[PDB]
Amino acid sequence: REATWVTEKPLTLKIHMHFRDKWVWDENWPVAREVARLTNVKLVGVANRAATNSQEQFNLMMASGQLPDIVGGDNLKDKFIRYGMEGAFIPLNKLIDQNAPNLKAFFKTHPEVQRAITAPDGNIYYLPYVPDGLVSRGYFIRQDWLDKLHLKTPQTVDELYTVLKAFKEKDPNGNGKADEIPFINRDPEEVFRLVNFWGARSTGSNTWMDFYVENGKIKHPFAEVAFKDGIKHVAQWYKEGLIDPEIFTRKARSREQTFGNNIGGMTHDWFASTALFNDALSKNIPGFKLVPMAPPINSKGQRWEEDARQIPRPDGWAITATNKNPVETIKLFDFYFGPKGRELSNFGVPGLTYDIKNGKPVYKDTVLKAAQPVNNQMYDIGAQIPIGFWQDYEYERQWTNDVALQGIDMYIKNKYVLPQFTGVNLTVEEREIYDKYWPDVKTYMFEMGQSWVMGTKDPEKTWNDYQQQLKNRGFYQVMIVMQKAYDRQY
């Protein structure tokens, strides 16, 4: 028995957790096993490991009969709220106030986080993934390629065009072949963010395709005329091969592939893991130098960094109405917000991935010297996963090299990061319109966006049909309630 046990009698619960379109909960994970040992509660996964879309899996689970005991994953906030009000997920307010002292304290000191996860009916239907940090992404460019081609760091979009064209046509890796791919990215959604170069927004926060506010008015990036004009430019860059032709399909290992084979010239991604490639590829590609770059001056005369860490994220886990042990479950959930629980969910397992030295968790050299980014290494053993947990930036600091640190400092110092959208508080009736139309409009917007970038549809010629479809699909009904809810707060 352990003082951390949340139940005297061993308890096993079923969890459906499919995340980042590639992973599922693994009861064999070192972290899962350690938490089970300490709490006496074991979670067994029931998600389909042979599936490449996490949202589709949530929907499939919801239509495959009786739900499991717990459901977790990334980008599920809206589903947790929608189905929570439908009775599929239970309210946690009471359970927390009565059995979770760590969470109760956390929320008292983090009122903004509590508000962000609360539903229109005032109920909390899930515990969020709470990131720790300030900046997230930044632009990175191949300094060695710039040097080899005698080009200066691009300061404007026009200068950037010239530089990327040079990367594509001037054989910077010197193998006599036109194999270079100027701009690459792990996230297909980043291709949409390129409209920033032409003064248009792509999202209001770290949450993909989120709304934003301008002069007291709620707006959505994909519906603005600025997007039409901006995406036309992105389409041109894609047409000319300045943007990875496989940008919508390569995905997850784009960096390992393109930087690893010395064909990638630039990206926009997280500072720590991206800068790590300088160390991982130092042996195979001497001179490889991927460095942070300030955003180029855009068509509106400004340097924009649209992304920032979002606290909390629309990720996490919830308790279903079929869970027969809600009290034991919330106690398990609370364990993660305690000192030991937070340490495990962030660093892995003591003696395996880290050791306590001078009272502080310190990653082993084998982890820090690995070619794989530390967050990827954590995913592999059940840490840094999108359950309800509190991220600790100290875990990240340990593998943020000087190149990354200096990039982070530059972005913080020069204030490139745009104000982030912190959401609004919808009434129950307003939420009904949101859940009825938004999901499908969002999917439609992505589809149109991809068509415009790839050239299968001309944004200029299809814009009217598009706006008509947005109206028919309920987009403006959603915009109307969003604005009303906004005016209530401010």
Q: Tokens for 385?
A: 């996963």
Near Ca ion by CB under 5 A: residue from 177, 357, 415, 461: 177
Give 128 or 264: the residue with its C-beta nearer to Ca ion.
264
CB of 261 to Ca ion, least distance (A): 10
Nearest to 417 by CA among 266, 294, 272: 294
Give 264 or 316: the residue with its C-beta nearer to Ca ion.
264
CB of 190 to Ca ion, least distance (A): 24
CB of 350 to Ca ion, least distance (A): 46
283 contacts Ca ion (rule: CB under 5 A): no
For Ca ion, which stretch binds (CB under 5 A), given 179-187, 218-226, 361-369, 429-437? 179-187
Give 234 or 281: the residue with its C-beta nearer to Ca ion.
281
Using CB under 5 A as the binding rule, the residues of this chain from 152 to 171 that contact Ca ion are: 171
CB of 121 to Ca ion, least distance (A): 59
175 contacts Ca ion (rule: CB under 5 A): yes
Give 56 or 179: the residue with its C-beta nearer to Ca ion.
179
Nearest to 398 by CA among 439, 370, 432: 370
Give 173 or 267: the residue with its C-beta nearer to Ca ion.
173
CB of 241 to Ca ion, least distance (A): 13
Q: What is the 3-state secondary structure (H, E, C) of the chain?
A: CCCCCCCCCCEEEEEEEEECCCEECCCCCHHHHHHHHHHCEEEEECCCCCCCCHHHHHHHHHCCCCCCCEEEECCCHHHHHHHHHCCCECCCHHHHHHHCHHHHHHHHHCHHHHHHHECCCCCECCEEEECCCCCCEEEEEEHHHHHHCCCCCCCEHHHHHHHHHHHHHCCCCCCCCCCCEEECCCCCHHHHHHHHHHCCCCCCCCCCCCCEEECCEEECHHHCHHHHHHHHHHHHHHHCCCECCCCCCCHHHHHHHHCCCCCEEEEEEEHHHHHCHHHHCCCCCCCCCEEEECCCECCCCCECECCCCCCCCCCEEEEECCCCCHHHHHHHHHHCCCHHHHHHHHHCCECCCEEEECCEEEECHHHHCCCCCHHHHHHHHCCCCCCCEECCHHHHHCCCCHHHHHHHHHHHHCCCECCCCCCCCCCHHHHHHHHHHHHHHHHHHHHHHHHHHHCCCCHHHHHHHHHHHHHHCCHHHHHHHHHHHHHHHC
Give 102 or 173: the residue with its C-beta nearer to Ca ion.
173
CB of 170 to Ca ion, least distance (A): 9
Interface with Ca ion (CB under 5 A), residue total 5
For Ca ion, which stretch binds (CB under 5 A), given 114-122, 137-145, 151-159, 172-180? 172-180
Using CB under 5 A as the binding rule, the residues of this chain from 77 to 106 that contact Ca ion are: none
The CA distance from 91 to 319, in Å, is 8
Give 177 or 461: the residue with its C-beta nearer to Ca ion.
177
Near Ca ion by CB under 5 A: residue from 102, 136, 143, 173: 173
CB of 451 to Ca ion, least distance (A): 30
Give 128 or 260: the residue with its C-beta nearer to Ca ion.
260
CB of 424 to Ca ion, least distance (A): 49
CB of 90 to Ca ion, least distance (A): 58
Give 175 or 414: the residue with its C-beta nearer to Ca ion.
175
For Ca ion, which stretch binds (CB under 5 A), given 130-138, 173-181, 191-199, 454-462? 173-181
Q: Which residue is nearest to Ca ion (CB)?
A: 171
CB of 228 to Ca ion, least distance (A): 35
Give 264 or 348: the residue with its C-beta nearer to Ca ion.
264
- Yes or no: say if 157 and 297 are a contact pair by the CB < 8 Å rule: yes
CB of 244 to Ca ion, least distance (A): 15
262 contacts Ca ion (rule: CB under 5 A): no
Residue 90's alpha-carbon distances to 81, 131, 323, in angstroms, are 10, 24, 9
Give 173 or 353: the residue with its C-beta nearer to Ca ion.
173
Applying CB under 5 A, which residues contact Ca ion? Answer: 171, 173, 175, 177, 179
